[PDB]
Design a protein around this ligand. Structure first.
Ligand code: GTP
Ligand code: GTP
Ligand code: GTP
Ligand code: ATP
Ligand code: ATP
Ligand code: ATP
Ligand code: UTP
Ligand code: UTP
Ligand code: UTP
Ligand code: GGL
Ligand code: GGL
Ligand code: GGL
Ligand code: MG
Ligand code: MG
Ligand code: MG
Ligand code: MG
Ligand code: MG
Ligand code: MG
Ligand code: MG
Ligand code: MG
Ligand code: MG
Lengths: 556, 556, 556
């Protein structure tokens, strides 16, 4: 095949993920079949035990492998369905090699980093880059992205493995893009090139040589600094790209394409791309990038979550709201509301912030309760569900709203003050939601119902069912272990609550939909993982429509 | 003695100079006698042939050594009078060692970088750090500042020489402060520590270990990032300083002092500083830092120069205007006017910018014509002198205004259209200013009259003479070779021009002062090099006063 | 405690192991309690699957952990009984950390090399250095030896962990000895210092600084090169040791001690060693080092093994023969005989070498058949046992001689040509030795009977039993799975074969001893692992005595 390593420069967070996804969505428009790999140099088998604050919004694949977030970036930009093995980590490699050694497949030899770990890495990359990722099309380009910055101790095995790969795989079949940062200190007033120079030198001291250099700055740098980069890093002034901070990332593919990163790649990897045909293929992205600027309607949605401090803990939620808002042709305006600044405990401590957050929640066309883990801020979600239930305000719950809304409904419509979750209060006599960990080896429901499953709609007219297109079953991605208690089912059904969607066994209620309320859907799965820029998700679409009050008109 | 190396981190321009001057002005307030050295790793004997755009505003010392700009930073913050040897450059070291080798003082030995260049560097630093710099007080601390960033190829001899110095000089007599940059990319939204980590690691790979780490950022970083720095760079959380972008640099000494960099230094170098007395000594700087904030008067001055693109080409001029404006208790507002966007040549090409610059020059309480070299923009200065002469607007000329004003005066008051400078038009029959290079070995006037000389005032009432305090002679620093033609002297004297100050020979007119005009002083020396924050320069003081119309009141 | 890292210089094989054991046997003579750790940067849980050619003579500890060879060097020089955890390997560390991560003890955190792997390494070293290694004496010094050379990619985690350790553990409690090589090319004719300089510089680029530098050369280097080392590596000329290639390694402790490496250590680690008492403690080693030179008797022993190409595949055997030869006051002279140059297959291919090896085996006072694995050269051992049985020549078999001698005895004294080992020919109808792998979890005999077990002597006069001192049971270290077939027992007993020693079940015959032959002992364990320089092993002692014909006289 043909590989494109995308290493990283001064810092982590410069834009490797967006640059890699842009390479992917260019080579995909030009006709090729692209796959991707993300290499995390951390010693973790998978992100299934990470916190959102670490790197943000643990993803979920179809087979059930909690992975990084760039694994979702790739899917949203390429419309592919990656697998568990598209995420290499130091832990995976070392565990594989250790198991092989113990079982004796390295029979009588000193297993050392070079060459055994790097041969494991190369065989992993070569075996994964050929797994059919979009049906039955054998891939043709593989965008490997190396996490972290060049120079770390954790990423020495990978830089060495690729230093050998670039010769093992016939260098005409291997590019390398080095994304770097060009700071512009406000005190001085001129962009500085020493960081990129030092990073390029450190990358050369490891053998590799940058075939491209993407200079990521805040404002467009002039031509003086491009000449300085080209000279002091020894690359042609046409293979140094400048990508400043654009408005939306749907502009990065186009900004690179107008800098000839299709011409350069087709010359450097010999891809045989027909330019006389590639013109009218990157059109949906121009359309999207223009709709990103030509919307003035200001629909404001409330996100009442726990981790609302770093704006990457909800990357999937935010990028699934933006897709729907762009599809309806309204302009999104997100407000982030903590769920702990909604209980009386801060009313006694900080009434100022209490009232400020409650006001923000009040003047907002819609409410969204994300998922999460733990007991902190769980009662604030109950408060928000109660408010949106008694104020006729649209609301959507994803895998934890379906819990924090049944809890409310029960407590404040049937009086069971004892209602709670088996996690929150294990000694409750009213367990409205109980776990179902009967696995013992994973064949029953049991452990976290990870991956994609089957959800069939029960009978009856339902707004969310109409939204999906009235099919019989849809497959979404669950990351839950609990469930609604099957003895409060009728107790909550002889009230304003419904139960439309569930599985084949019919003992896992997963789509609740209040009656009389304009929009009070809440689902047990994660509908945000299946959203794509040209194919938004039906629950978020319904939330936005019912929020700007166009839902019935859209239905008709 | 005791040495304080101040190396540099991610970029050049982070603040090494201000941090070093702050160390100096703290240890000077605590009673010690501080000297300084600046180490430029460029191969240049001196800056006497540099351009302002390279590093900015070639300085001039008392003996006549054109040096860097940090050599003026040190003087303005410590009130010392440095020498030629307070500026090491790779060129100086290599030329010294090569001359020694050729003359045979390394008799029969292989002169190599280690140890001969580094021994030359160490002997230079030790011999210079003991030269009485403020009269007869033998210094006690030496603030060596290493230019450039750690990792460059040019600064390997110096890092090695100091790696050996820290053992040759009894490590209890040697600190090290490492100024580094902590970027905060707007796309991500969190300060990043990887650059400082990488720089500290690269500095450790050279032997040295940071005794301090000054983290220079744009906005104050929280405590999370301070803990991250302290951990991932292995320094105590009390020896990591944070200096954000303050308003004026008179705040940096105080901001460091309140972070205990006096306590830490007195503990680490064993300086025997009496804290029960050091309290009421750093008071002039608190006064200045508060006067920097509590002025609201908006006096606006025009700077019509050539290099007005990078705001360091006039560092001395700007910092000499700010001193006077602070001493008068007005708030400065500088406007930078190109001298080439004032001739008809842009009127024919860009009348928009032509009129914009002329308007900026029009609505400004004062005019200042700096010095410079060459013929570009020399006629725009004539235009500005003419405008300020026919509009009764105060003006000051420094070593090139004294030329561009005599040129105007002659041309537009006696009609000698042929008037020009021997540089501009060598074939002129009217040479109003002629060179005086009769040196042939430097003993006559001859070459650039560098250094400080004697200027006696001729007889007669003069505003500038009254400003200086009516002394008989003052010593300023000249950097000129030309002079007023001694045959147009009376021709320009039987008009609105005067000649008050000159040397002992009386054939070098160097202070002109128009009659009838409120303020049209112009001088042949550089009065900006002798300005200090608590002692402004008389010409700039007079310019500001006559600009805000308080000159006569101040005189009385 | 107090730690002594012993890193390595230009090459691997320079002498780290002997230098570390010498530190140990000095600090042990001075009264302290020393332990040891060996750090192998290879990714292998243990050497239990290594080949002798890789590093040489897989060792066996008391609990049953096949380890490196330096783990036996330590025991032979310190008389301690190390454990499984005294051997760190990259595999052990990474598997430990991965298991911890998966079970969740790093709850929600990004497990990365720094700091998690290096904290695992430091906690391992600190927890192991306090395990009572010689009964109940808590250790006081720990000699950590870092395998490999400084600069390898495999040994970056360990160098980083120790860079942090030297500060975590109060630097007055941490030394560092850097063993380096000083080549002397025959073409040039002068010892070269550039390799040691480069290695010391590379070690400084990692933070650590050599407290000692042991210069290992071939012939004693003069004082010029010691001065060059001291200068160009910045260490005092009294902390640079020179250890040339001595005759026997019992000289290295004394050669270091006369260079004041006791004084330097007691000054640098503050050990409180009483020199007025340490004089008459290092006396057994002077005695041994002199007996190494003052023996002239030339006893020649035959070693018929398979791996006789690199003179480290039998390190334990050779060092157990030398101990006995020194205890008898004879001078050893080993001959290494391949066991494959003894079959007719080379008689048809290389009769020259065939006859040469057979002659070497012929003119040798004794024969020794080591252990091993596989089928190659297994018949040559049968040939040698037959020759030594029909020529009345002493012979000793260790864990494979007990097989290759019963095989012979059966085949050539009862005619069972079908006799063989279940490994050699699985389809044999005469299986004289059959496996016993009935473990299925390790509680039965089952898998390799690793570690030390119990061996009781059955009744009857036996030379080997008299040699051991006529005790009832002795514990040796087995590494075997096979066993003598329990149905040929009486068939071989009504002949010139005996069975004296066995376990408590009496179905594992492990000490055979022919009748009429002067010395034909063969044992199923490995008696060479329990030999010490001042306490030789009884089987090897008996072999040497019966070889030089003094066995009966020694018995009396
Ligand atoms: N609390 C909790 N976290 C889990 C569990 N299973 C997986 N996790 C993950 O482990 C992470 C815990 O790391 P933390 O940084 O302490 O995050 P947290 O538990 O939510 O704590 P806060 O961020 O302060 O609310 C969570 O964010 C989850 O993503 C679980 O059963 N309980
Ligand atoms: N032009 C000129 N420069 C001199 C002379 N002597 C010293 N210099 C220095 O050398 C520098 C020339 O470098 P340049 O970068 O070309 O600056 P410049 O000559 O002013 O050219 P511009 O910046 O484009 O106006 C000047 O800035 C002076 O500081 C001289 O005689 N003529
Ligand atoms: N052959 C063999 N080796 C084993 C076995 N179990 C452990 N080993 C070890 O694995 C090593 C195999 O590595 P090799 O380099 O091929 O050594 P070898 O098998 O003896 O092959 P040669 O050295 O050519 O005789 C052996 O030396 C043993 O130390 C086993 O069951 N069979
Ligand atoms: N050119 C750009 N303009 C505007 N925003 C951008 C641009 N590039 C990236 N971003 C934003 O910056 C955020 C971080 O970028 P990205 O995820 O690519 O960092 P990263 O280097 O991939 O981080 P990591 O290596 O940890 O995965 C993204 O959410 C993205 O939306
Ligand atoms: N803490 C600060 N707040 C505001 N401005 C600052 C601060 N530190 C430095 N500056 C400004 O930044 C400019 C450049 O700083 P400085 O001259 O110290 O850089 P430098 O590292 O010394 O450059 P060089 O190494 O090339 O001499 C100075 O003019 C100074 O006024
Ligand atoms: N000073 C010396 N004089 C004579 N022989 C020596 C000396 N030092 C070591 N040797 C011999 O060299 C051989 C290899 O030495 P050693 O085992 O110490 O190497 P090493 O560096 O420990 O190897 P590794 O790091 O692979 O364990 C040993 O068998 C030892 O007998
Ligand atoms: O104060 C200084 C700073 C730097 N130098 C030396 O002169 C050269 C200055 O070069 P710089 O490091 O200042 O900038 P740059 O052009 O290399 O890259 P950017 O920061 O613009 O991105 C470098 O070679 C430095 O070693 C000095 O001599 N004095
Ligand atoms: O996408 C990534 C980025 C980084 N990593 C790896 O996990 C760790 C992330 O650490 P970072 O490099 O992202 O940040 P930092 O804490 O080291 O310093 P600052 O930027 O905040 O100033 C690093 O060890 C990296 O190698 C990943 O696994 N994936
Ligand atoms: O041919 C040469 C070789 C070396 N040199 C340069 O002169 C110096 C010679 O120094 P060397 O490298 O030749 O020897 P050394 O003293 O450094 O260490 P040993 O090899 O003796 O152990 C070094 O600085 C080298 O760069 C030459 O100029 N020419
Ligand atoms: N702890 C709950 C919440 C899931 C979520 O929404 O994140 C569960 O596992 O079902
Ligand atoms: N070239 C003129 C101008 C000097 C200046 O003002 O910079 C001289 O040397 O006199
Ligand atoms: N393979 C035989 C030989 C053992 C040996 O002597 O090394 C066993 O395991 O018993
Ligand atoms: Mg980070
Ligand atoms: Mg990424
Ligand atoms: Mg938690
Ligand atoms: Mg620069
Ligand atoms: Mg500077
Ligand atoms: Mg010029
Ligand atoms: Mg080797
Ligand atoms: Mg060793
Ligand atoms: Mg084999």
């Amino acid at each position: 095949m043909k590989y494109i390593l995308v290493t990283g420069g001064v810092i982590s967070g410069v834009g490797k993920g967006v640059i890699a996804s842009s390479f992917g969505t260019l080579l995909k428009s030009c006709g090729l079949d692209v796959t991707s790999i993300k290499i995390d140099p951390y010693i973790n088998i998978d992100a299934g035990t990470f916190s959102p604050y670490e790197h943000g919004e643990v993803y979920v694949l179809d087979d059930g492998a909690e992975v990084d977030l760039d694994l979702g970036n790739y899917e949203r930009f390429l419309d592919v369905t990656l697998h568990r093995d598209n995420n290499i980590t130091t832990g995976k490699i070392y565990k594989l090699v250790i198991e092989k050694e113990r079982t004796g497949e390295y029979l009588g030899k000193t297993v050392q980093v070079v060459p055994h770990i790097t041969d494991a890495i190369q065989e992993w990359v070569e075996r994964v880059a050929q797994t059919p990722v979009q049906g039955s099309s054998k891939p043709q380009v593989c965008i490997v992205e190396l996490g972290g910055t060049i120079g770390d101790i954790e990423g020495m095995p990978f830089v060495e493995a690729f230093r050998q790969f670039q010769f093992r795989v016939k260098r005409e079949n291997f590019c390398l893009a080095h994304v770097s940062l060009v700071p512009l200190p406000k005190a001085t007033g001129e962009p500085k090139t020493k960081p990129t120079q030092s990073s390029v030198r450190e990358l050369r001291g490891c053998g590799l040589s940058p075939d491209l250099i993407v200079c990521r700055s805040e404002k467009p740098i002039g031509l003086e600094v491009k000449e300085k980069i080209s000279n002091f890093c020894h690359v042609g002034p046409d293979q140094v790209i400048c990508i400043h901070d654009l408005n939306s990332i749907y502009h990065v593919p186009l900004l690179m394409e107008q800098n000839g990163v299709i011409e350069y790649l087709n010359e450097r990897l010999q891809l045989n791309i027909d330019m006389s045909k590639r013109t009218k293929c990157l059109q949906q992205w121009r359309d999207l990038a223009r709709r990103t600027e030509t919307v003035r309607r200001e629909v404001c949605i409330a996100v009442v979550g726990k981790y609302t401090k770093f704006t990457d803990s909800y990357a999937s939620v935010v990028k699934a709201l933006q897709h729907a808002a762009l599809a309806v042709n309204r302009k999104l305006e997100l407000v982030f509301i903590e769920s702990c600044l909604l209980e009386e405990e801060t009313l006694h401590s900080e009434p100022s912030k209490y009232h400020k957050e409650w006001q923000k929640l009040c003047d907002s066309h819609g409410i969204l309760v994300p998922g999460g883990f733990g007991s902190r801020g769980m009662e604030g979600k109950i408060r928000a569900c109660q408010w949106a239930r008694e104020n006729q305000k649209p609301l959507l719950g994803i895998c934890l709203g379906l819990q924090a809304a049944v809890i409310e409904f029960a407590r404040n419509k049937l009086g069971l003050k004892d209602a709670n979750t088996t996690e929150i209060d294990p000694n409750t006599a009213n367990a409205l939601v109980i776990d179902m960990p009967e696995h013992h080896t994973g064949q029953l429901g049991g452990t976290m119902r990870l991956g994609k499953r089957i959800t069939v709609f029960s009978d009856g007219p339902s707004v969310i069912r109409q939204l999906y297109g009235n099919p019989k079953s849809v497959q979404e991605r669950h990351r839950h272990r609990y469930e609604v208690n099957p003895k409060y089912v009728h107790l909550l059904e002889e009230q304003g609550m419904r139960f439309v969607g569930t599985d084949v066994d019919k003992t896992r209620m997963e789509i609740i939909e209040l009656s009389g309320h304009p929009y009070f859907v809440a689902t047990q799965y994660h509908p945000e993982y299946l959203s794509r820029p040209l194919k938004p998700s039906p629950p978020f679409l319904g939330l936005i429509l019912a929020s700007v009050d166009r839902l019935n008109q859209y239905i008709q």
